[PDB]
Amino acid sequence: MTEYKLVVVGAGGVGKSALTIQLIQNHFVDEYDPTIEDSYRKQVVIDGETCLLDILDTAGQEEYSAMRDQYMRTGEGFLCVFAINNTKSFEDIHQYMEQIKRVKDSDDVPMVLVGNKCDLAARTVESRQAQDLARSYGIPYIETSAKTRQGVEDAFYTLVREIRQH
Ligand SMILES: Nc1nc2c(ncn2[C@@H]2O[C@H](COP(=O)(O)OP(=O)(O)NP(=O)(O)O)[C@@H](O)[C@H]2O)c(=O)[nH]1
Ligand SMILES: [Ca+2]
Ligand SMILES: [Ca+2]
Ligand SMILES: [Mg+2]
Ligand SMILES: [Mg+2]
C-alpha cells in the first residue's frame, strides 16, 4: 500500500505526542511524558483509499539538532506544531520550517502549520499571525485541540492530501 512518511515537529510541550495519540489511539490523557523518538504505523482509509500512515513523533529538545536533520531528510510531509498559548513555540516553529527547507533543498515540501491547544483560554498567538506565516510558505494553517479532538483528523488528513496532490 501507499505509505505517507509524516513527521510531527515543534518545540517541547506543544502537544506533538498528544495530537498523534489522539489520531492513532483515540484518546487524550493529560500527563507529562517527553518524547525521545516514537514511531506510529497505522493503516487508514483516506478518501476511499487504503494507505499506511508512518508517523514519526519527534523530540522538542533543541539539543537533538543532528538527529533532526536526519528525520527531516527522510520525511515526506511535516506537521509543524506550535501551541496557541506559547508565543515562543510560534517563533521556534519558523526555525523548524526553515531547517526543513535547508535539509531537503526545497520550498515545496508538504507541510501543515498547526496551532494546538485551541481549547485553552490564555491564547497569545493570534490566528491571523499564524495564517500569514503559512501563507508565506504556501501551506495550510489548521488549529487543533488534542484534548477535545477538534481539528485533529483535519490536520493530519490535510497533510496527507498535501502530499498526495503534490
Ligand atoms: N489543554 C491542552 N493540553 C494539551 C494539548 N496537547 C497537549 N497538551 C498537554 O500539554 C503537555 C505537553 O503535551 P505533549 O503531547 O507531551 O507535548 P510534546 O510536544 O509531545 N512534548 P515533547 O517535545 O517533549 O515530546 C501535556 O501535559 C499534554 O497533556 C491540547 O490540545 N490541549
Ligand atoms: Ca541544503
Ligand atoms: Ca495546498
Ligand atoms: Mg512528545
Ligand atoms: Mg519551489
**DSSP output for 58-120:** E---TT-HHHHHHHHHH-SEEEEEEETT-HHHHHHHHHHHHHHHHHHT-S---EEEEEE-TT-
| Domains within the chain, CATH numbers bracketed | 3-165 (3.40.50.300)
CB contact at 8 A, 48 and 70: no
Query: Grid cell 490566528 — which residue?
Result: 127
Residue 27 CB burial class (10 angstroms; 0-12, 13-18, ≥19): exposed
Output the CA 106–ligand 2 centroid distance in Å.
8
For residues 89 and 117, what is the distance between their CA atoms, to the nearest angstrom? 12
Which residue has a Cα nearest atom 12 of ligand 1?
Answer: 13
Which experiment gave this structure? Answer: X-ray
Residues facing residue 116 across a β-bridge: 83
Residue 21 CB burial class (10 angstroms; 0-12, 13-18, ≥19): buried
Find the angle CA(163)-CA(115)-CA(105) to the nearest 5 degrees: 40
10 CA to centre of own chain: 7
DSSP summary character for residue 27: -
Give resolution in angstroms.
1.8
119 annotated as belonging to a binding site for a ligand: yes
Query: Grid cell 492513532 — which residue?
Result: 24
- Joined together, the cell numbers standing for residue 163 give 502530499
Ligand closest to the CA atom of residue 148:
1
Output the CA 108–ligand 5 centroid distance in Å.
5
CA distances from 21 to 56, 65, 82, 114 (A): 12, 24, 16, 15
CB 44: neighbour CB atoms within 10 A? 16
Contact residues for 133 (Cβ-Cβ < 8 A; gap 6+): 90, 93, 94, 113, 141
- Strands in 49-58's sheet, in edge-to-edge order, are 37-46, 49-58, 2-9, 77-83, 111-116, 141-143
Sign, Cα dihedral of 67, 72, 78, 81:
positive
Contact residues for 129 (Cβ-Cβ < 8 A; gap 6+): 90
Which residue has a Cα nearest atom 13 of ligand 1?
Answer: 15
Residue 85 CB less than 6 A away from ligand 1:
no
At 3, the amino acid letter reads E
Please state the length of the chain: 166
Output the CA 141–ligand 3 centroid distance in Å.
10
For residues 121 and 147, what is the distance between their CA atoms, to the nearest angstrom? 13
CB 160: neighbour CB atoms within 10 A? 22
CB contact at 8 A, 73 and 31: no
For residues 156 and 52, what is the distance between their CA atoms, to the nearest angstrom? 13
For residues 27 and 125, what is the distance between their CA atoms, to the nearest angstrom? 26
Q: To test the ligand 1 pocket, which listed residue (28, 63, 156) has its Cβ within 8 A of the most ligand atoms?
A: 28
